[PDB]
Design a protein around this ligand. Sequence first.
Ligand SMILES: Nc1ncnc2c1ncn2[C@@H]1O[C@H](COP(=O)(O)OP(=O)(O)OP(O)(O)=S)[C@@H](O)[C@H]1O
Ligand SMILES: Nc1ncnc2c1ncn2[C@@H]1O[C@H](COP(=O)(O)OP(=O)(O)OP(O)(O)=S)[C@@H](O)[C@H]1O
Ligand SMILES: Nc1ncnc2c1ncn2[C@@H]1O[C@H](COP(=O)(O)OP(=O)(O)OP(O)(O)=S)[C@@H](O)[C@H]1O
Ligand SMILES: Nc1ncnc2c1ncn2[C@@H]1O[C@H](COP(=O)(O)OP(=O)(O)OP(O)(O)=S)[C@@H](O)[C@H]1O
Ligand SMILES: Nc1ncnc2c1ncn2[C@@H]1O[C@H](COP(=O)(O)OP(=O)(O)O)[C@@H](O)[C@H]1O
Ligand SMILES: [Mg+2]
Ligand SMILES: [Mg+2]
Ligand SMILES: [Mg+2]
Ligand SMILES: [Mg+2]
Lengths: 134, 327, 402, 315, 342, 333
Amino acid sequence: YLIKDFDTNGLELDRERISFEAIIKGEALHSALKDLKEIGCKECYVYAKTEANDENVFALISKSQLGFSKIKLPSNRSILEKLQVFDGDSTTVIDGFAVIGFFDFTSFDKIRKSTKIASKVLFRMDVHGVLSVN
Amino acid sequence: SKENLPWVEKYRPETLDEVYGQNEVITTVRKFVDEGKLPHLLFYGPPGTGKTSTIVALAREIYGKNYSNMVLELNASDDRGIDVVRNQIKDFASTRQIFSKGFKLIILDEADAMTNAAQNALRRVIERYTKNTRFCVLANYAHKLTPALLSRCTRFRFQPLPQEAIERRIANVLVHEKLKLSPNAEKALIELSNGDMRRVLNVLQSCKATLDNPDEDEISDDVIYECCGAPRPSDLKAVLKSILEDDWGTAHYTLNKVRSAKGLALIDLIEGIVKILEDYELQNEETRVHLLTKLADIEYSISKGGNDQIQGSAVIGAIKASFENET
Amino acid sequence: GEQWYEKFKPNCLEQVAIHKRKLKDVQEALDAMFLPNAKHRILLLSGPSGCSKSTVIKELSKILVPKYRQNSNGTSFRSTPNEHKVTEFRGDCIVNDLPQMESFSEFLKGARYLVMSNLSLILIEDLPNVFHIDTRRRFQQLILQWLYSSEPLLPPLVICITECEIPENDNNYRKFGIDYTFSAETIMNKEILMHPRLKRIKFNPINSTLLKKHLKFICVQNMKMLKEKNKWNKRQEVIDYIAQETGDIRSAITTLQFWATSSGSLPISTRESTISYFHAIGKVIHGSHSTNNDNEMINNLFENSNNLLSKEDFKLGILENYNTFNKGEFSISDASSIVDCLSECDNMNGLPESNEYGLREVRKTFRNISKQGHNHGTVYFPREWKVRKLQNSFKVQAEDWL
Amino acid sequence: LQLPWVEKYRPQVLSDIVGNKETIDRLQQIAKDGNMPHMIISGMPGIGKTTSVHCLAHELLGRSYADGVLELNASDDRGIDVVRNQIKHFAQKKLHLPPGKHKIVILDEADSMTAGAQQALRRTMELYSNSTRFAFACNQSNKIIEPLQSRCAILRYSKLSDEDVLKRLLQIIKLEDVKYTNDGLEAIIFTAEGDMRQAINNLQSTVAGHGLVNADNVFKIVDSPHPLIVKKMLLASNLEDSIQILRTDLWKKGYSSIDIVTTSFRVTKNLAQVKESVRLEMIKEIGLTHMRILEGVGTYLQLASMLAKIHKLNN
Amino acid sequence: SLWVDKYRPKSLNALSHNEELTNFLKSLSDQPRDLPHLLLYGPNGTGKKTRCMALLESIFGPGVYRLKIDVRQFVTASNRKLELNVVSSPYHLEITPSDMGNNDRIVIQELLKEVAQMEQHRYKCVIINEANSLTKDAQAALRRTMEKYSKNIRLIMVCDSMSPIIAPIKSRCLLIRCPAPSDSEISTILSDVVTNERIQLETKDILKRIAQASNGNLRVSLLMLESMALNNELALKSSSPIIKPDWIIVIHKLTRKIVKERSVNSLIECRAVLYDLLAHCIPANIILKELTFSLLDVETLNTTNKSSIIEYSSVFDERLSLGNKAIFHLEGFIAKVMCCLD
Amino acid sequence: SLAQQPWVEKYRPKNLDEVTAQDHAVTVLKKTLKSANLPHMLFYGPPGTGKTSTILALTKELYGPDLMKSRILELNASDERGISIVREKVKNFARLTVSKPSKHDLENYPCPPYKIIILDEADSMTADAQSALRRTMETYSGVTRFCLICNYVTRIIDPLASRCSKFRFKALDASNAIDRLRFISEQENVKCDDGVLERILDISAGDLRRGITLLQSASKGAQYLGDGKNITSTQVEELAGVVPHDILIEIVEKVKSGDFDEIKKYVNTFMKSGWSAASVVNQLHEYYITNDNFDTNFKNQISWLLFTTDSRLNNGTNEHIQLLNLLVKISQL
DNA sequence: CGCTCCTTCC
DNA sequence: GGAAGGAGCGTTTTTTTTTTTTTTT
Ligand SMILES: Nc1ncnc2c1ncn2[C@@H]1O[C@H](COP(=O)(O)OP(=O)(O)OP(O)(O)=S)[C@@H](O)[C@H]1O
Ligand SMILES: Nc1ncnc2c1ncn2[C@@H]1O[C@H](COP(=O)(O)OP(=O)(O)OP(O)(O)=S)[C@@H](O)[C@H]1O
Ligand SMILES: Nc1ncnc2c1ncn2[C@@H]1O[C@H](COP(=O)(O)OP(=O)(O)OP(O)(O)=S)[C@@H](O)[C@H]1O
Ligand SMILES: Nc1ncnc2c1ncn2[C@@H]1O[C@H](COP(=O)(O)OP(=O)(O)OP(O)(O)=S)[C@@H](O)[C@H]1O
Ligand SMILES: Nc1ncnc2c1ncn2[C@@H]1O[C@H](COP(=O)(O)OP(=O)(O)O)[C@@H](O)[C@H]1O
Ligand SMILES: [Mg+2]
Ligand SMILES: [Mg+2]
Ligand SMILES: [Mg+2]
Ligand SMILES: [Mg+2]
């Protein structure tokens, strides 16, 4: 078919300013996405936070007919490996600032199948609010 | 390449600078974008006045190369039911910006074909998401639009293109592609266009195709009429004079000769005679009433298809009877 | 905080705003249905909004169920006497392991067991989603099975249907009977309505006398605030207005409370009542007393009753009943003009302004020849349906002969 | 990109709403007392129905507005399942609002809900009325089924008067320090036709496009209303004048024939200057022309013939 | 068996009236390879279907007269069942889409196209009864179906009036006029029938009356001849009364009532008779025509009354053609006629 | 197919070179043979003017037998053309990439970079379906071209008529299509008197299909007769269905002598012969208008009378009633 | 929206 | 025993396209 005038490359992540970046196991993320799908999630919240003494928090908060539910990943290296919350710069890491991204679950659930076969998942949020998943 | 495209698409304006005949609207939109105070837009107008072209050029100017992901365009050819409005448009208007390029534009082309439920659902979407989202509604028939949607959109009326704008665009087309157009041919083209640029471009393309060698041959009024098949003004004048002065047999012979020499259609002749009569001196209103009613009835009969000779004789008799009221 | 129409609810059968004749008829029918082997199995109550159908049903149940309910021998669920005189169906119940259309069935299959020692009056006021075609078919089939059932004992079944119009909505494009009117005829079918074991009693709007009496009682009950706010001396007029504005007791009480609570002076208004078919025909033919300008009346009727006036049934009724003006003794020219106008309207592809033209022509023609000394005939529903049925029979017979 | 003044200066308290002073005072008394009943607010678009309902809910609740208001709308799904689950659970929710307050369910644009949804609303209101109240907002009150109307107090909002529109426009101009004159404000009010949202939008467009507000500047952005031009065309003594109006003011300005015919019918419906028979004949001719246009002949000659027939009927 | 069918000619040579049409049919069947689509238009009862069957027999032999019937089911857009009794033969096919009302278009799209695609090398002949009753959409759909698949199928259509036929169809078909039989030919046919049936007759004039009471329709002529013969114990006398269709007598009585009583109550009473006639599935247009021409036969009325009657009849016939419900226009015609007469 | 097809189907133009009387548009269609610049086309005209044949020949010329089956999508009234079809099938075909031409077709045929969608009989499409075709016709104009064929141009919505270059197919008469009919007759060895072909064209009233069918019928009749005599005008008139001049004269005489009883009796007798009301109405119009023995006012009234009766007939009215009313009304005048 | 008839008040 | 108020009467026929909800899946 004729190539759509729309450029599919228009959506990309700016590497200069990354709000935060995370590494997670594929199995845990797939389980969390399945859990959100079961409860009929309508809106999703990606919450990321880094604090002192090696404190890492990555959570998915679902707004649905159940109300508000929370799924938080552990701090174990085997599941959640390594986290930064840069605050926008990709150079300096600060502690205490929480990055929150609000998404429609319709778009968020389109990566569950890709995550089922995943062996590793890299999450990245920029200041502009675009979520990148490798 | 673009040479393959029809002139109606090859000569599509790429920037607002190429848009002619909408100077007030163009300037208002320029000021809106320059001051960053563009409101919800409702471009209402007849076909081929430059609404889609104007909005596309505006989107190009605002964003540039990002027009792909900064603007969401929906038209009649696509599904625009209540479900589409509730999911696709809502998702597009409720998401952040790729590069903070001011706002996200939604071009609801041919929105007059949308369902009432879809418009009702879209009104509150328009109201809720306005900080970083904008709506443009293009229409040719306002009565199909709900009153609330009309009230919530700033209305811009696209008048029929003035003569000067069409002459400028014809000059640009001729300069772009080597071709000569006679002043009489240009005047006839303007008259038959009735403020439609699509007709202008189509007739120009077909008239170039009519000319044997489009290198040194100049377009003339005869070529324009032959290509379009419409009657020349002289034929209309002659047939009207015969009807209003000559006898029944002479009038019938004149009409038959006029419409058989070039195979003219009776609908075009009736329209031309109506236009000519609209600017005549009448001393009585009943004459005008008879002319208008009988001619409208005859056109309505012609629209459904019938006996051509019967309809022609009907036109002649209606004109003769109506003009008998005078004096 | 509590709304008055709920606070001032009847505590006995004598406080229900129901006419004596209708109340006696309902009592007799319900008592008959409670007999050991009752001929009637279903009580179909149909009427407008707020005519005290459910109220009178519950009040009568409170007196009847204790009389016939067989005494228990310690088999009651709880220590309480099981105060469940009325068992009602809830249309928004969503159990886990059950399809939606099967909800009502699951109710009915349970309702059969509420007999003898577990006697209870089965009331169906909150109907299932009858707008869904499959749900409506299942509901009709279940009702038919109940009527044709073969159990020695069944509990009395009462179906209260609030007859109201369905406003023309954009989300709905179908033009079925239920899409136009929500009544017993559209919800049920001919077989159920004509069943010998089903009794249908039609309720009427509450008359002005009962409304005035109950409004006066309500005002007397709340005397401190009315006297304090200086609205007592003018209460009567307000009540009168309500009495002549609506037949809905609930709406009347709500309007009275709204007027009383207002500290200033807000105009008194009540819910709008749809004009019936014969009422609309009479308005078109003989006119309206509440208005003298025909244009205003016709505009109001079209704006408020567009659904009824758009159908060809109204045009056929006008054609059928235009001759009852003076028992037919009026100039034939007027009849010819009316029929010619209706015929020419028939060619306008059912445009709304074609209906406007027809109704306005009829109104003008009847106003021209109107006089004080007029005696009218009887209004009859057009017999196009009978012609269609005869045509269908003719088609069947012709097919057989062929 | 500053927000448009239709939203930037949206009233937040009921005291800032101009027009319909009696109903607004009643709403203020309701907010003060707190005993809000089920209500239906009907009126013309853009007169302050949604704003009034939202302001009343805000004043009633305050810190509990988020947890005590369930705003549904046409853009949101409002089917029978929605009533069965979301509205039902919201009504069942037990709050701790002050003694004289109740949860508010704002069903904006309620005149578009499905029949089954309204039938379920009957039961949900019959059962959850002790702690939940419904504030329907619509344009036509009859679009709500009678069983639901029976439980709701009806408030009909009237068209805005010129004085209220002028007062609010002056307040907005003073807040924005916009330069204005008398003729410009008069033109804005005249073109508003009682719709304050339209008035604000036209004022903003005029100031942003031409700066100082003038009669000519306002007329540039906003044309004369179509219904008034149509009424002038219909009410004419000479057929020539009506034809001239139709050509210059309607046909040459880019108005479709179908729109002209529909507005002509609407105007003839509400015109009260001639006898019933004349208006009836005009409606008949308008209908014939509408028929002839719907089949494809949307030509100027058809409108001219319609005008000629109307003029003949008048004489 | 009914004498109408048991005497039906089964060959072109058997025809004894309208010899010009018989010769034209012979010419058409002379080279049955390039036969174009045919549209036979003529007054009802002339024998158009008989002529079509005779031509089909002369072309494809005698299997056409061996008719078979089948049930073909149709599913519409709304999943609605439709049943059309398909009359088929090993050499031809017959269909009456008018029985499907406004759904006839589907028959044009799903039946004719599918069979046309199938290849029989000779062609198949399809007959459409009451072509003028086809909706405009069906006629439009027929155009390219006929044009594209002329190799496989040749179409035969029959009608009593070409007015409701769209111009493209008339362009795509070869028109054949079928004049109705004259009084003499009907008299000869009836004489042969009575002679072969061993029925007694007194004078031939009776047959002429049988020809006059029908006035072109041979089917009703034979039916009423049989009715008279059986009623009179197989002895037709000169004074034997002529039996007419019941609805005809009803219409004449209604006309007499209209003439006698020009009043509103008279209109109301006539409305019931109109309802009964419509309930007998009598077409509204034929009702209007018969009422008009019964009224025009009244001796009391003068020229002006008759002219007004015919004007109103034509106007209301157009309104019936363009209208949905038929009662309005019939009642309006009657009311206007009564107003003028008064 | 040489002797097993109708003459109309066997003589369908195969190439644009043999289209007879559509030069005003055939020249434009030919000059774009090597232009790669074919625009969207709207052919409109009366029945049997050579619209489908023209587009089929154009497609054959540009693509050829092998490539035609892939670059052409044809839809007509017989096909179901609902709004959903327009949205899905037409859009999908328009958005498709043009199939790669082979070596042979490129060597021998232009093979333009665009395909064709032919919506024959577009006047039968609903307004909404026509609206759904507006932007599709424009978005994919670089790889697709549209052709809409119709008899009633007014039935096409204004936006589509604006989006398409309009070609009017003129009526074919004895001065435009005599050559084609003469060629067909010569190839079919059909014999006729001088002016017979002109009479057939005049009877056709601007429809070469009707003329060809009438010529085929006349040839069949002549062959069956087997007399070796040229076909005369009488035979073509009789097979065409034209009322004989004698019947017209008798009708005129009855009308002139105003008498309702006599007129209605004669009308009943005439209509019991199977004649068509349209033909007799046309003949009466010709006779009355062309006659110089009548006053101007009578012609003015009779023109409107004939127009009204013809309009009534086109609506599908009873021919008997309409003819009787027309005759009575002319008698009154 | 009237007719007709039945209840009730007075 | 007029006078007013009120009840009962007076009612049921399909079917083009398209969109949309509902339910099941
Ligand atoms: N102002 C203009 N200046 C130059 N060319 C124009 C102008 N308006 C229209 N055209 C030409 O005509 C074509 C019409 O394009 P559109 O902008 O879609 O017309 P339109 O006003 O949208 O008609 P509708 O309402 O969609 S049918 C353009 O692609 C140009 O080729
Ligand atoms: N005196 C009274 N008589 C009857 N109902 C009363 C009275 N006073 C208050 N009401 C209330 O008014 C309301 C109307 O009565 P309902 O019987 O519920 O109406 P309805 O006949 O059921 O109409 P629907 O279908 O419920 S809208 C009920 O909530 C009653 O409790
Ligand atoms: N009475 C009023 N006083 C002051 N501002 C008003 C008034 N009415 C409308 N406005 C302004 O117009 C804006 C839109 O008003 P809304 O109340 O949303 O319209 P509306 O009356 O609800 O019409 P609908 O129902 O949404 S179509 C408000 O945000 C105000 O800025
Ligand atoms: N210009 C022409 N030159 C030669 N033969 C023609 C011409 N026009 C029509 N014909 C003949 O008549 C037949 C008519 O075919 P079409 O081209 O489909 O007619 P048409 O213009 O499509 O009529 P409509 O509009 O579909 S009813 C052709 O197959 C030819 O046999
Ligand atoms: N030429 C004929 N000779 C004898 N009988 C005929 C002839 N033509 C028709 N009929 C008779 O007329 C009857 C009805 O004819 P029919 O086929 O119904 O005509 P149409 O097709 O015009 O309605 C047939 O039963 C047939 O017996
Ligand atoms: Mg556009
Ligand atoms: Mg109740
Ligand atoms: Mg609102
Ligand atoms: Mg064709």
